[PDB]
């Protein structure tokens, strides 16, 4: 069993000081600095995690392809497909009701 050491000058097991021990040539084990776990986007109404958008750090979406950070739909990337269907029905049905309620009832 090969025992390793911290490479950087951090000495405490904080969230940002996560390490992974991998093997290298000759039976030597080195230290890799592993990333933190992020959260994905959430629907602004129901707070459910959206599909089609990866769970990566906020600055990493700048490196993402322009089509890999949003879904091709009205309110894509901010609202679930169910969050949007009810939006359309609300917009249409209420406007229809306001046409028979007022405007020569």
């Amino acid at each position: 069993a090969v025992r390793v050491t911290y490479v950087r000058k951090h000495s405490y097991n904080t969230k940002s000081n996560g390490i992974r021990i991998v093997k290298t040539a000759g039976g030597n084990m080195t230290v890799q600095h592993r990333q933190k776990i992020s959260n994905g986007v959430r629907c602004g109404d129901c707070g459910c995690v959206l599909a089609g958008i990866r769970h990566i750090r906020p600055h990493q979406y700048g490196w993402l392809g322009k089509s890999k950070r949003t879904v091709t739909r009205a309110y894509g990337g901010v609202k679930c497909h169910k969050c949007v269907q009810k939006k359309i029905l609300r917009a249409f049905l209420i406007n229809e009701h306001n046409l028979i309620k007022l405007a020569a009832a």
């Binding site: 091709t72 739909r73 009205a74 497909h81 949007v84 029905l89 249409f92």
Partner: peptide
């Protein structure tokens, strides 16, 4: 008709 889902949602 009014489309409810897809790329053409709300058209």
């Amino acid at each position: 008709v009014i489309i409810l889902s897809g790329r053409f949602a709300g058209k």
